[PDB]
Amino acid sequence: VNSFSGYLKLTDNVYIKNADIVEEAKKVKPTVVVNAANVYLKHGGGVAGALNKATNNAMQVESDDYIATNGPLKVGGSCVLSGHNLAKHCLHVVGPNVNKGEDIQLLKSAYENFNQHEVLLAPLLSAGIFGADPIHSLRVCVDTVRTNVYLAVFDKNLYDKLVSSFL
Numbered sequence: 776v777n778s779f780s781g782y783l784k785l786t787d788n789v790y791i792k793n794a795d796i797v798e799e800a801k802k803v804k805p806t807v808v809v810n811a812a813n814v815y816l817k818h819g820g821g822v823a824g825a826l827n828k829a830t831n832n833a834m835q836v837e838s839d840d841y842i843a844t845n846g847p848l849k850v851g852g853s854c855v856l857s858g859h860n861l862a863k864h865c866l867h868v869v870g871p872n873v874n875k876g877e878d879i880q881l882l883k884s885a886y887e888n889f890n891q892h893e894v895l896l897a898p899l900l901s902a903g904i905f906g907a908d909p910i911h912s913l914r915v916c917v918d919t920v921r922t923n924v925y926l927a928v929f930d931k932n933l934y935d936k937l938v939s940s941f942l
C-alpha cells in the first residue's frame with residue numbers, strides 16, 4: 776500500500792489521474808518525482824518550469840551545478856537529483872522533443888529509466904510542450920515500464936481521451 780489517491784488503474788503497474796504533477800508532489804511527497812527535462816536541465820516551462828518554480832528555483836541552481844560538472848544529458852537519458860520540497864528525489868528524464876527533430880524511437884529508452892525506481896510519480900514523456908502524441912507516449916509507457924508508475928495528466932480533456940482510447 777502507498778499514499779497515491781484517486782488514480783484509475785490501467786494495468787498491473789500503471790495508474791493515471793487528471794492532476795497537475797506539482798500539486799500532486801506537494802500532497803504525496805513521493806520517493807521519486809519525474810521531471811520532463813531537456814539535456815541542459817534548463818527548466819524554462821512546462822513540467823520542468825512548474826516543478827522548478829515550486830522549488831523557488833532551487834532545482835535550477837542544483838541543475839546548473841550538475842551540468843557544470845557533468846555536461847549535458849543524452850536524449851533518452853536521465854539523472855537523479857534532489858526532489859527539494861516536492862519529493863525525496865527528482866528523476867530528470869529527457870524524452871525526445873519532436874519540435875527539435877529528435878527520434879521518437881528514443882521515447883522507449885527514456886521510459887526505461889523509470890525501471891530503476893520501484894515507484895514513481897511522472898508526467899507523460901514528450902507530452903505538453905515536448906510536442907509528441909500523448910496517446911503514443913502512454914502506449915510506450917505501458918509497454919516499457921515494469922515498476923509502479925503514477926501518471927499525472929494536467930489537461931482534463933486529454934486525460935479523458937487517454938482513458939477512453941486505452942487498449
Ligand SMILES: Cc1c(C)n(Cc2ccco2)c2ncnc(N)c12
Nearest residue numbers: 795796821822898902903904929930
Ligand atoms: C505544466 C505541465 C505540462 C505542460 N504538462 C504536460 C501536459 C500534458 C497535458 C498537458 O500538459 C504537465 N503535466 C503534468 N503536470 C503539469 N503541471 C504539467
